[PDB]
Symmetry: C3
């Protein structure tokens, strides 16, 4: 398409929402290609990532870790306004793995504090894709400080199985997983720093161990548990998008399955089926479709259970509905 042709396309104008929720959208595209407009502001801010008050100097798109999920359809244009407030201290940019050219957009979006930029790309490939900040020379430090999220480029006809039959979800959640590398003093106690730059040298040394101190969903241990558990009902169809911008993960729904899993995240690659535990390499997003069949609590984890239970990578679903004794029953309850 020419400049005039793109300028003539309909616009929309989307208000991004905080994960794990996803902004309103339609599974099947409404009409022809659009220029879909998104705005994000980068926040440099202290966050608490565990129950012991561990503080990190986050970088965070729209103030959240992960940044929000942007949803468009194949062959739409995604037009992002990115704002770096003058109160920030660092240059930031954005690399969309969905995009083609200029280091994912990183080369065209380097904004110092007090600057903004608008990037447009054609979403030519359907799938879920990571995005992250990527300032030359300080790439992993921004990413593992929280500056990453994902987008979903839906097929224009929505999702399908391997034989071309429709898969339509009732709800969608976006789980971003973050590996954090928090320095410790000689006594083994997590360190606090007055300014983010004070933390840099110490942080790189921990990063070089390739051993995170915390691996969390939605930015903190227990962020998707308790009152903040995800929810569903028996019979409900749920898409769970999962991303990890820097490090491998292996999602597992404890008590369920991934009925269909695009483990590569790419919708033209047929989904795996009946999955127990799927695998998403660092630098990618994946997505799993599941129909709940049993009510109760479910845990959704990185199935390195040390990472899940000791380091923070565990979420919950609370599911309403009627128990199915055919699928599972206690024939004899625990008894002496």
């Amino acid at each position: 398409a020419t400049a005039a042709e793109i300028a003539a396309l309909p616009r929309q104008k989307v208000e991004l929402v905080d994960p794990p929720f996803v902004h309103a959208h339609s599974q099947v595209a409404e009409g022809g290609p659009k220029v879909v407009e998104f705005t994000m502001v980068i926040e440099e801010k202290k966050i608490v990532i565990d129950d012991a008050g561990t503080e990190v100097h986050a970088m965070a798109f729209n103030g959240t870790v992960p940044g929000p999920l942007m949803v468009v359809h194949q062959d739409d244009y995604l037009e992002l306004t990115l704002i770096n407030p003058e109160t920030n201290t660092l240059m930031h940019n954005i690399d969309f793995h969905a995009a083609t050219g200029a280091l994912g957009g990183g080369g065209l979006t380097e904004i110092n504090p007090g600057e903004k930029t608008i990037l447009r790309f054609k979403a030519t490939k359907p799938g879920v894709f990571v995005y992250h900040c990527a300032p030359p020379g300080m790439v992993p430090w921004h990413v593992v400080s929280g500056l990453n999220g994902a987008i979903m480029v839906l097929p224009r006809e929505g999702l399908h199985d391997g034989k071309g039959k429709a898969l339509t979800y009732d709800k969608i959640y976006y789980v971003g997983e973050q590996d954090f590398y928090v320095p410790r003093d000689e006594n083994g106690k997590y360190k606090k720093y007055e300014a983010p730059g004070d933390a840099y040298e110490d942080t790189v040394k921990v990063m070089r161990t390739l051993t995170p101190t915390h691996v969390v969903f939605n930015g903190a241990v227990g962020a998707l548990t308790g009152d903040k558990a995800m929810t569903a009902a028996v019979g409900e169809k749920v898409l769970i998008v999962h991303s990890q911008a820097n490090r491998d993960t292996r999602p597992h729904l404890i008590g369920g399955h991934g009925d269909y899993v695009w483990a590569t995240g790419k919708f033209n690659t047929p989904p795996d089926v009946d999955q127990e535990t799927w695998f998403i390499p660092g630098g990618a997003a994946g997505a799993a479709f599941y129909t709940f069949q049993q009510p109760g609590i479910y845990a959704y984890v990185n199935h390195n259970l040390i990472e899940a239970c000791e380091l923070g990578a565990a979420a919950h679903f609370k599911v309403t509905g009627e128990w199915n004794d055919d699928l599972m029953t206690s024939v004899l309850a625990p008894s002496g």
Copy 2:
């Protein structure tokens, strides 16, 4: 099916055998759905895991690491009697990744020492699947102390390739891989503890390094080597089921291939073919089908060769038969 309908199905009544062997079964289902009955008892016991006499306080289904492979067919019911002897000190339960509901069955099977329980689930999905103990708050500690194994849910028509043609094995082996985290004193020597609870605090600290001290097959360095090597003949078709309940692995048959590999473990996901080294994420089982073409020794390894050769993850096959010079020949033997 209703309660009366399930109660009316034929029963069987399987005697589990120690890995890497697998209990008698039929590849193609014999008749309609059955309730297949299994019993396991959990043993808390000291085991030796290497050649230097390193001792671990195991937890072990039927006294082995891994626990035994249970084989049923799709849409059978698996009915497990699980017994926790009064001489044990800890509560245990079981999560079947093949099952749907109540945290894989974990929520319905919490048995203290001196208790038993019977769980029944419908095996709705064909594949190989991990099972493991999962007591709330001490999940990875039980799993990496040895309390895991796998099941196989065969399609009712047995295994097939990607074009629907039968794949029938002559023999099957189950290789369970276990990551152990053994504490060391200030001198670097592995520690022994009088009681398992004495080892807990020290063990968690090693687990949090995400760096195992030992990665072993069938519960010990060299457990599947020497007199205990697996065996085959040229022309024989072998299924090798492999599981890892907590950590990634990358199996490789040195001198062979995975002719067909269900790397996800799930039989409705078509197998990869002609594999050199396949990948199984922590929290999953996978399976590889191979027809031996050459006699001699083979090594079967986790192809992180540090894990294989330094940490224990190596097994052998001894294969009988006639050498094939077409496939491989020494044109000039090593010579000055």
Copy 3:
């Protein structure tokens, strides 16, 4: 085929070239099966792997890390002459993951300094495959000292997509990724050793951490950057073969995609498509096909960005041609 039948086949006689370049070959086979002849000599030599002058006692096929890519077609015979100079101090051999029998050929090729050997195998399976040295009892030490590479066994009809349509590349590159484990003194400074044997004990201890000090492409930090960047033009079709003999990797072309990716490396396993970041397990090769659509610099990385940016796993492409504003445009350049 019989001995006389193989002896009667046409020969060729290939001169191996240094990575990332690949020796001349034809995508579609020219005529019937051939015996394709390759010669490599193993060099034990000091190399510098980073910008700070870090020295390793390499072992290196034809003096390079990785060793060169050998290209044959399915059902050709690969006949390798392997030479271990008398100035070397260690026995070496070779395991071809493409081969069937005798530990990949390792059992038939053990050559002491001053010896040579000639091994022939039938390349029965199409794909890219790792090869590496594998001396009993010192396997990972030779591999992670640099003694590995890959081969490509092309289908006789060349490459195809999932629907059988031809995929013909304009150029091919071979990226070998190497994990190095370099000892440090108490002050944290990398150690130099007079003889390779002096480094052994210290090296094993670092290897057992499973934490590499360096993860590099083509044998050194920045080896495929600057003047040594790979190159392409807009519209050009490029195959990128990637191998890792010991450890997982997750390749990503920053600013592009893997249009078709044989992530398992095996051509009879249909390629994934539209990939952002693919995954190659340790002990395997994979291959990605991409048509460049935008000019400029691209980074090609292991997308654990700590491994990429801190440990060395990053390469560049410099791509000529006309910018495509449809695919991507800066609507508003960075501005206050």
